[PDB]
Design a protein around this ligand. Structure first.
Ligand code: HEM
Ligand code: HEM
Ligand SMILES: C[C@H](O)[C@H](O)[C@H]1CNc2nc(N)[nH]c(=O)c2N1
Ligand SMILES: C[C@H](O)[C@H](O)[C@H]1CNc2nc(N)[nH]c(=O)c2N1
Ligand SMILES: Cc1cc(N)nc(C#CCCN(C)C)c1
Ligand SMILES: Cc1cc(N)nc(C#CCCN(C)C)c1
Ligand SMILES: [Zn+2]
Lengths: 414, 418
């Protein structure tokens, strides 16, 4: 069977056969589509693990043109021995690298996948303590930041065993700003991070109580209670936000960090679960300029910017929000570019994604893609992805959501 | 039960209405087709005249639903209605809707249109019964009256005009236009396109049928009307019925010199209305515009009027690199102009902020009284400034309820001319 997707702007038609490989659920049924649901839906037994491991090893050996080889058959036997004797197995370094890259390649919500095969993989599977995790994360941050010439990277900590000894980065990204709820109901800093900021303070973090306090790392090794660490400030690259035409913009006192580094997701390779696997790339401008700054639940700067622009804010049909949103996103891109910190605008990013998508259909037979996430949060239809039909399905290896660790961790101290 | 969450407000709604869905969405538990324009060809009855065991179950379903809606399930009139429909199908292979059933069905087709952000208005719909129509001349009369009623000197009113249902498939009534009012598009000698590129094919059919094109950038197309399966016939809508808005900007005095206009009445005329297994292949319906339909899609799509270049030039933006966001900046100004122009001429229009806010309210009303609201996020979220509208942050369930509006093939792909 084949499925066709059409681009309604160019009339190009692509043919998807890769979906026949899909594994788990989208969340939809034959009679209901759940494509706009954010999250649609203890450890694997021996019997469950065998077929998952085989499927991954088969696809690895097919990727390197050695399917059926003596080395292929011996690896399968070796993996089977380990599962039989230990209820788990260990990836070779080559398989871990291949698996991490393909989880990125398979991330249907990521528009930056043209870069998927250029991913620096740091193997941290020998780590045993939160101090060791801190060291690996500092090295990742330094390598990835690269004085502003950002490089994609992932660091992979030891895989889940019985579920009682999980490695976890409690942060949602390696670098984020604190949020503080005030007595009068206002919020200082980033409202998204209020809860995690409270956990840090409880663990003994002494907060500066400013608007852009870089949060400490809260690291959990081997299922133990998590521990606090301060990222050395010289490793945290930041960009002050100014505007090429409005001299007053710099007086808003805005800044942002250069390195987007997701740390709360789970990486699944051949049935193995890597619950701590922070990965980083570089920003698309709208992530900061539209969501971080202008979401009503975030820094929410539209009103203040529109004021300094002298816009008519009495009626929505003046489009004062739309006008202010564009200028903010102009400022974000100008600031990063002026400081020579890698960033991509949404027009360039979506154009590259269409090229990537077409290449993937030709060389791989498809490209799972989540239109709801791929289309940027402003100016949707003037980007090419808006007009591109897409098919969403789940391939493995994959990145997955997982529960926040404070909702499941059972504490040990006192 | 299925829950939907709003991630801005944390409101959670519980959906039971989806249990009443009839047609496949196209998705499976392994693949999602939510961004496919036409994901499914699952229809309720086969291509042409059904047999009795194919049509009667669908009729019984709709009549049951209608009499349930008015608290008369099993009533004397309900059971007679069923026997009446059974005899009609028995003797004519079809059946006829009562006036009240037709009105209920049209309003519910709008209420069930998951892609429409305007549905808070669904019960305020004027229904023109045109099922006595027999000729293209009669269709033109009915359409002129619809347009005049719906335009209402700029205080627009939602309406639908319903022509005779399909019988055997060779006597279809069709409006060949895709909307009652659109602009012509012309292929130029050098290869470019003048006017609206979306309508180049339809324009050529009209010229081929004897229409004399003025060959401008905003030539209102004639109507091409097909009655009872006969060859279609051309008619010129009287221009005093065609309300148009010249586009200007509240700050940029040069904007008027771009010479842009648009029409006030959005009037979809190429969809199919399905009620109880009956197919109304000509059912033009109209409401009023959301500004972004004109200012974002009609004006700024690359394969439409494609005016971003022109506007940005006049604005003296840096068009050297995408990252100056000159396209985004011009886009906003164009949409300010469109809203300001319609509002200045007292022609009904809604901005995407007010429309999406109304739809969230509609969603809450529908979950409270009906147990659900089918909604297509891909279509509901406006094509600019998505995440600063509330629907961006609203999870939605999409499912197919009947009565409904459906796509149908373009008639020049199937008509054998006489
Ligand atoms: C190299 C430059 C990259 C760019 C420009 C980019 C861009 C993006 C953007 C704009 C999003 C949506 C983010 C949001 O709205 O919250 C996203 C999501 C995502 N990215 Fe990428 N990305 C890049 C690299 C990577 C890398 C290196 C990985 C992993 C190895 C990755 C994996 C993902 C995943 C799994 C998601 C979905 C997250 C979720 O579901 O919440 N990306 N990306
Ligand atoms: C009264 C004001 C209305 C507003 C503001 C409105 C708004 C919209 C918008 C913006 C779209 C997306 C159109 C596109 O992107 O091409 C749409 C789609 C749609 N509307 Fe409404 N609408 C209104 C009235 C109506 C009425 C009266 C009906 C039928 C009786 C209707 C039925 C539909 C249908 C079926 C679609 C989907 C069309 C498709 O799939 O191509 N709408 N509406
Ligand atoms: C409800 C909806 O699914 C949700 O708001 C999504 C929409 N699309 C998105 N797209 C991206 N890139 N990031 C997001 O957080 C979201 N949020
Ligand atoms: C491929 C994609 O589904 C297609 O471009 C859709 C996206 N969303 C849309 N939304 C609306 N309202 N109208 C449209 O025409 C489209 N086009
Ligand atoms: C590597 C990367 C680059 C980028 N530009 N963006 C992201 C992201 C995200 C969202 C993560 N999600 C858990 C909220 C990730
Ligand atoms: C009544 C109505 C009002 C409005 N504001 N918009 C539309 C539309 C549309 C698109 C239909 N589709 C076949 C392309 C329809
Ligand atoms: Zn779906």
């Amino acid at each position: 069977r084949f499925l066709k997707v059409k681009n309604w702007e160019t009339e190009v038609v692509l043919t998807d056969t890769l979906h026949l490989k899909s594994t788990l659920e989208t969340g939809c049924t034959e009679y209901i589509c759940m494509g706009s649901i954010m999250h649609p839906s203890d450890v694997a037994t021996k019997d469950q693990l065998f077929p998952l491991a085989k499927e991954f090893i088969d696809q690895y050996y097919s990727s390197i043109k050695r399917f059926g080889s003596k080395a292929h058959m011996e690896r399968l036997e070796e993996v089977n021995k380990e599962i039989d004797t230990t209820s788990t197995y260990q990836l070779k370094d080559t398989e871990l690298i291949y698996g991490a890259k393909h989880a990125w390649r398979n991330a249907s919500r990521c528009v930056g996948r043209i870069q998927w095969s250029k991913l620096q993989v740091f193997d941290a599977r020998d780590c045993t303590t939160a101090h060791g995790m801190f060291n690996y994360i500092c090295n990742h941050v330094k390598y990835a930041t690269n004085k502003g010439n950002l490089r994609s990277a992932i660091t992979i900590f030891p895989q889940r065993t019985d579920g009682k000894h999980d490695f976890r980065v409690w942060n949602s990204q390696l670098i984020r700003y604190a949020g503080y709820k005030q007595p009068d109901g206002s919020t200082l800093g980033d409202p998204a991070n209020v809860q995690f900021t409270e956990i840090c303070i409880q663990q003994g973090w002494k907060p500066p109580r400013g608007r852009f306090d870089v949060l400490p790392l809260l690291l959990q090794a081997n299922g133990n209670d998590p521990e606090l660490f301060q990222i050395p400030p010289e490793l945290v690259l930041e960009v002050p936000i100014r505007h090429p035409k409005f001299e007053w913009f710099k007086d808003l006192g805005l800044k942002w960090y250069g390195l987007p580094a997701v740390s709360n997701m789970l990486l699944e390779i051949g049935g193995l679960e890597f619950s701590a696997c922070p990965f980083s790339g570089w920003y698309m401008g709208t992530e900061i300029g539209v969501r971080d700054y202008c979401d009503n639940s975030r820094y929410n700067i539209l009103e203040e910017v529109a004021k300094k622009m002298n816009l008519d804010m009495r009626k929505t049909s003046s489009l004062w929000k739309d006008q202010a949103l564009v200028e903010i996103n102009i400022a974000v891109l100008y600031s990063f570019q002026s400081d020579k910190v890698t960033i991509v605008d949404h027009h360039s990013a979506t154009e590259s994604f269409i090229k990537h998508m077409e290449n993937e259909y030709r060389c791989r037979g498809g490209c799972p893609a989540d239109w709801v996430w791929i289309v940027p949060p402003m100016s949707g239809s003037i980007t090419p992805v808006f007009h591109q039909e897409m098919l969403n399905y789940r391939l493995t290896p994959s990145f997955e959501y997982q529960p926040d660790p404070w909702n499941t961790h059972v504490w040990k101290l006192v």
